[PDB]
Amino acid sequence: GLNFPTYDGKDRVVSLSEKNFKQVLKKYDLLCLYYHEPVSSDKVTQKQFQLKEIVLELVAQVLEHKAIGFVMVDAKKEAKLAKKLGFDEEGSLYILKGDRTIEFDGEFAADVLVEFLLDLIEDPVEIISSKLEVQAFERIEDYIKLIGFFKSEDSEYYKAFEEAAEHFQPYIKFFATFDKGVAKKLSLKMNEVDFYEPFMDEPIAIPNKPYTEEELVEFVKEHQRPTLRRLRPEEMFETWEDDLNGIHIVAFAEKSDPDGYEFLEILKQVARDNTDNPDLSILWIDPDDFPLLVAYWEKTFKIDLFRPQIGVVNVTDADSVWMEIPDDDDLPTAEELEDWIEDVLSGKI
């Protein structure tokens, strides 16, 4: 007798090969495929291997929904002999069809991975319309956004918006927009495209005429940064790989808290009151969950966990410094905020 929500009976999804993979690829819309070797390793390896097989076939067998061809690229074989098929190394959860195909070197767990399954099989992006969707336009205070007024469901600019969103599954936001109501409320003069800031919700319009792939992918990949960065599931290490510095400049303040709302909105008060402030963008860990990595940061970001924290980590070997003189659990913020941001305070340590 198993448990809940443990797998349904037997591990049935597929570790496979070429012909199957091609028939089923051209049949399917989502293909979650990890490439792996013929694994037979040491003691400490087959444990994470077994947990990998288990989160895999648990999410799979517990799903059996219309979306995924699932599990493994068996080894080296025909991919290698074509070139490597233009792939990565001995491991990656490459997901097919998405854009054409995309990677997965994100983090491994249930809630996150099924979240990925659904919100990625979106097919395509965010259709907004009603007055309550006018509210949806002035709703998201969390992410960086990209709205656009368009002409049809089967439209040229609509298509560009779709395949550019699937090129940017990364994350951020993609509002497909219609009608004179939100047209008059938003006010961008024509059926165009408009970017938007996380908090300090600004319509940063994309400002020419018609716009295409590398142009709006230009606005997105060029200006994905702004002021504070909300860190999430895989988004911490993935914004590490998305161009860092070496100094992990973090604001560590969990939500459901005074320190969360106050830290968040005093740095974001520096954003929304000092619109510019280009001291390079500060990041935001705010531990509600992800406590394993919050334990990793409890020992490696010295000894800190449930406090109003803020500081930097010099990646490896040396140090991981934070807030010190001042501190106070009920922090001095305000102009002290203006300082200790505006260069850890202008003057160094």
> What residues line the site for a copy of itself (CB under 8 A)?
1-3, 5-7, 9, 41-42, 44-45, 47-48, 51, 54, 59, 62-63, 65, 109-112, 114-115, 117-118, 128-130, 132-133, 135-136, 139-140, 142, 256-258, 261-262, 288-296, 298, 305-306, 330
Distance between CA 260 and CA 308 in Å, rounded?
7
Q: In what order do the strands lie in the sheet with 145-149?
A: 126-128, 175-177, 145-149, 193-196, 203-206
Distance in angstroms (rounded) separating the CA atoms of residues 31 and 70: 6
Least distance (Å) between residue 346 CB and a copy of itself: 25
Tokens of 339: 């300082």
Tell me whether residue 240 or residue 261 sits nearer to a copy of itself (CB atom): 261
Query: Is the Cβ of residue 25 or residue 121 nearer to a copy of itself in the bound state?
Result: 121
- Give me the least distance between CB of 188 and a copy of itself, in Å please: 21
Q: What whole-number distance in Å separates Cα of residue 115 and Cα of residue 108?
A: 12
167 or 173: CB nearest a copy of itself: 173
CB closer to a copy of itself out of 64 and 273: 64
Distance CA 153, CA 300 (A): 50
Residue (265 or 339) nearer to a copy of itself, CB: 265
d(CA 31, CA 98): 9
Min CB(263)–a copy of itself separation in Å: 10
CB of 349 to a copy of itself, least distance (A): 26
Q: Decide: helix, strand or coil at residue 344.
A: helix
135 or 245: CB nearest a copy of itself: 135
User: String of b and e for 226-241 (b: at least 16 CB within 10 Å)?
Assistant: bbbbbbbbbbbebbee
* Minimum distance of a copy of itself from residue 288's CB (angstroms): 7
Please, what is the minimum distance in Å from the beta carbon of residue 116 to a copy of itself?
10
Instruction: Tell me which residue of 40, 145, 59 sits closest to 104, measured CA to CA.
Output: 59
